Amino acid sequence: SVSQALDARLEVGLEQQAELMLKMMSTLEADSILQALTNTSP
Amino acid sequence: ISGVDLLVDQPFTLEILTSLVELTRFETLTPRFSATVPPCWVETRTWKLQTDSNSWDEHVFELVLPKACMVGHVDFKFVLNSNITNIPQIQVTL
Amino acid sequence: WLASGLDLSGHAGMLTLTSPKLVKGMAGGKYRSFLIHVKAVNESENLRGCDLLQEVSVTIRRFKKTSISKERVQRCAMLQFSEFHEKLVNTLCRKTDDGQITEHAQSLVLDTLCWLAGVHSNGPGSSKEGNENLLSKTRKFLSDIVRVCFFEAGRSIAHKCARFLALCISNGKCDPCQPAFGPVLLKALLDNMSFLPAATTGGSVYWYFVLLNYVKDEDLAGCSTACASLLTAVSRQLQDTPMEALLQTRYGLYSSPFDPVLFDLEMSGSEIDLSDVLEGSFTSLTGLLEVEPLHFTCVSTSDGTRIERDDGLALAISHASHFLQPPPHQSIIIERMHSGARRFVTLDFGRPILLTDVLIPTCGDLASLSIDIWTLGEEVDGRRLVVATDISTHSLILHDLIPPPVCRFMKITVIGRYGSTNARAKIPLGFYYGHTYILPWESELKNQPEIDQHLAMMVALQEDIQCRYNLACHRLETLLQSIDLPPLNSANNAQVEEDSRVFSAYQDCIQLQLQLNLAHNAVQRLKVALGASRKMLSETSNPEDLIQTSSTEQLRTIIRYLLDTLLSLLHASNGHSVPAVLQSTFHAQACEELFKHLCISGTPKIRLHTGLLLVQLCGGERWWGQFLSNVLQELYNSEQLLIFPQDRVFMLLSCIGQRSLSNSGVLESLLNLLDNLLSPLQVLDIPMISWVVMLVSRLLDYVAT
Amino acid sequence: VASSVMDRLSYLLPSARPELGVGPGRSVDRSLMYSEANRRETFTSWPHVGYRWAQPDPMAQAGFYHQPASSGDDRAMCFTCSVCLVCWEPTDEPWSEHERHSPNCPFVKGEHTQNVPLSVTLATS
Amino acid sequence: TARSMVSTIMKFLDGIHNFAPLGTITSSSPTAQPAEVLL
Ligand SMILES: [Zn+2]
């Protein structure tokens, strides 16, 4: 995965949860890609 | 309310859009505001919750600003339990 | 509900609450107090709902006080009269005849569009008329705005438009008469893939592809067949010189040193050996050619801490090139370590500069790090950027700060891990990325020369580095003419001052080519900053024509990205039945053509990844062993004049055969190929026979294992 | 609660207020030092008031008292875990130093101890 | 008997050297200490 690190100066903004949800798409993307590389063909 | 020079009918000049963007920023409140909570929480302000089931159904926090001004927004930060295995159905309403 | 603010871990969260009805009620100037209610709804410590919260924190942020009085009616104007919103949409459509709309004005109208979407996210019975009108005007001209924002704009405008569109995704509390944004955003996204190889930035198409990968869950067939057609087109385009191929065979050098333009540079702090798979997070930092690095000068240092380095127009041009340099790798050493070693360092850039991206390698002996930036004083304009407490797990990556801050002084505070042993370690400074020229609109956020002379000196630097790159290319070509060309095929090539000088010449050519390309991106950013625009995608443009007229490095990068999307698409089936559309368009000869056009001349990463695509898509097909026998027979002949890396593609072929050993046709077809091969033992080709018998020996070793 | 009650009772009676014996070669009364005001009173002879983070008020509220072995040192002991702390630094945050040097201290985990906050004494003065 | 190209191109896909640390040791009689220190 990636580090759980987000912009602290952007917390004063309204899109902190927006960047947070973009980051969890990115992490699920990385996990799904690693799973597709590791898994074989049934 | 009529007889006011609005900010909509003007053409898209650079200075009017720049003033609109510079308007839409937000600032931090200073000095400290006022707030009270039920006593199950012990201690920009923070609290820690203690396991009390006397008023677990409802919780009411009261907030009084130091001055009546232009309300930008309210930031509500929370940290949950580390052993959570299911998404809780808990709501917070202003 | 709580589901609109949970973090990635799920153990914390944050909400930012505001509404237009708040200021609508504050227009009376009467309200001063508020209540908030926490309530658990329902359809060891058995904490339920409100008892599940551990730690709480409350803050209240006020609005900015401008010089424009009576702001109450000005804010109620957009909420009451809706004719502003479609006008904003008109400023997105470029249909107005009042001049030409610049990128800064588009950024401003998109910012206020984001703000109005945010306030219109939750309407507690408040009139949503204006919100419905602006959403309808967005959906009416969605193709035009996505075209003018993600194809005809830079990184900032496209990133802001992606932010606005995903915020429109986030607040999808639509009425039952209104359809969701998903289907329509999917259709608008696939209506503009044809203009993809004529794009400008890797990060723009990266966020584009992220949105595609997220929203593709609704409809699968149209995106799949469009993607397959674009695979076929760019694969048949990429095949069109033996020069980089000869480089790839002799030295494994895949980046073209003669093509002067790239697309993006990918690096991270975390050839590739295929044995472990027999790097996913490396796409975290994209688009590093539009943003140049800086240079580091340490000023302040804490106790027990030392920063070390890890191991007349021509003069002005050389000095500007020296300012435009990637610095060598440096690091921090600590004299005495302990549990929570608090150390502090200060770095100086020498001048005010725009900072956009920061990368800190993984340091396994440090608990947390925190970065502060300031230009004049620590208490004057100091704002906290990021504190990370899991440096030992992964690396710190922060990409494309929007809006980009300006700064001159970096403060790094590090706290060591608990129970840390007293063994010395290194904390690398990483790589810092920013903008050399500070734009006037970005200067006003927080002795500046004029645009024209600065643009002229970068153009002079671009010309000088182009001459240097051309002479480096000529030297590299004249040196590679002197490479030994034995008649011993290629077996002796895999079995030296000449090699070292070729490697040095290639490294120099790559360095100057990268410098030239990022300088070209700098002159392009200043040219669009003058008031110009980048390449306009005309409506009469043939997609195949702009496919052909695209740079080869851009084609390679776009292939790797959208086949990454294909890997994610194949994994999104969760091991269930693959859709029949991509299983039907990827028949035998199409698969063979894709293999012969991508795996022969492509980089090893995209080669292995497309092999993984082929086994995860058509792994159970009956024709795989026959395809392997044909590609072995038509690649490893003694009369084969094609210059391809036989060894690495042979090991990859063994790997993909070892993957497809689940199919029963591969072993039968390879033994039949052997039977055909030594049929004259009922002329002889000793090297190719040796290749195929060692291949089947490795495959049988996998069978035995 | 009981600690705050007994500290308030001790504060209401001046006859039950012994003098603060801050000096070398003389141990302090730990039961009397349960109040926060006594702990922050022990730092009158602190030679490092000018430090940014080694100020008397932020470090005394963490549960520390000055018990110097001589005149001019910076020996501050905890009144619960009695952690030996010497050679204080201007960058030494009191909460972080108490967590690092004594993670088993009940102030670090936040459980309820015999500590008496200054607000209770000020509200019962 | 010469080494051909196959041994070269398979040797690395996976000057007299010691092989004692790779192997294990044993004895037919129960000794007071094991002999792996010799290896
Ligand atoms: Zn203690």
Q: Any CB–CB contact under 8 A between C69 and chain B? A: no
Phi, psi torsion values for B63, nearest 5 degrees: -125, 130
Six token digits for residue C423: 């063994």
Contact present, C297 and C350 (Cβ < 8 Å): yes
Q: Is C333 helix (H, G, I), strand (E, B) or coil?
A: strand
Judging contacts by C-beta atoms under 8 Å, the chain C residues touching residue B89 are 1-2, 40-43, 49
Secondary structure of C220-280 in HEC code, one letter for each residue: CHHHHHHHHHHHHHHHHHHCCCHHHHHHHHHHCCCCCCCCCCCCCCCCCCCCCCCCCCCCH
Burial C222-260 (b: 16+ CB within 10 A, else e): ebbeebbebbbbbbebbeeeeebbbbbbbbebbbbbbeb
- φ/ψ region of C231 (left if φ > 0, alpha if ψ in -120 to 50, else beta) reads alpha
- Please answer whether residues C364 and C394 qualify as being in contact, where contact means their C-beta atoms are separated by less than 8 angstroms: no
C-alpha–C-alpha distance, residues C41 and B91, integer Å: 7
Total CB pairs under 8 A between chain A and C: 117
**What is the separation of C-alpha C38 from the centre of its chain, rounded to a whole number of angstroms?**
40
Give the residue from C271, C493, C654, C694 with the most E CB atoms within 10 Å of its CB, the best one to mutate.
C694
Q: How far apart are the C-alpha atoms of A36 and A40, rounded to whole Å?
A: 8
- Which helix (DSSP H) or strand (DSSP E) does residue C541 occupy? none
Q: What are phi and psi of C313, to 5 degrees?
A: -70, -30
> How far away, in angstroms, is C388 Cα from ligand 1 center?
27
Whole-angstrom distance, CA of residue D84 vs CA of residue D79 = 11
Residue C120 and residue C84 in contact, taking contact as beta carbons nearer than 8 Å:
no
Which residues of chain C make contact with E13, given a CB cutoff of 8 A?
275, 651
**DSSP calls for B22-60:** HHT-EEE--S--EEE--TTEE--EEEEE----TT-SEEE
Phi, psi for residue B62 in degrees, rounded to 5: -110, 140
Q: Which residues of E are less than 8 Å from C651 in CB distance? A: 13
Helix (H, G, I), strand (E, B) or coil at C140: helix
Of C699, C178, C241, C288, the residue nearest C522 (C-alpha): C288
The answer to the question of whether D48 is labelled as a binding residue is no
Which among E4, E8, E13 has CB closest to C651? E13
Rg (Cα) of chain D, in Å, rounded? Answer: 14
- State how far the Cα of A31 lies from the Cα of C83, in Å rounded to an integer: 46
- The method recorded for this entry reads cryo-EM
* Whole-number Cα distances in Å, C270 to A1, C161, C283, C359: 11, 31, 12, 11
Q: CB-based contacts of B6: which residues, under 8 Å, 6+ apart?
A: C73, C74, C77, C81
Is C458:C416 a contact under the CB 8 Å cutoff?
A: no
Q: Could you give the 3-state DSSP secondary structure of residue C301?
A: strand
Q: In Å, how far is C335's CA from the nearest CA of chain D?
A: 17
Asked if residue C328 has a cis previous peptide bond (ω within 30° of 0), the answer is no
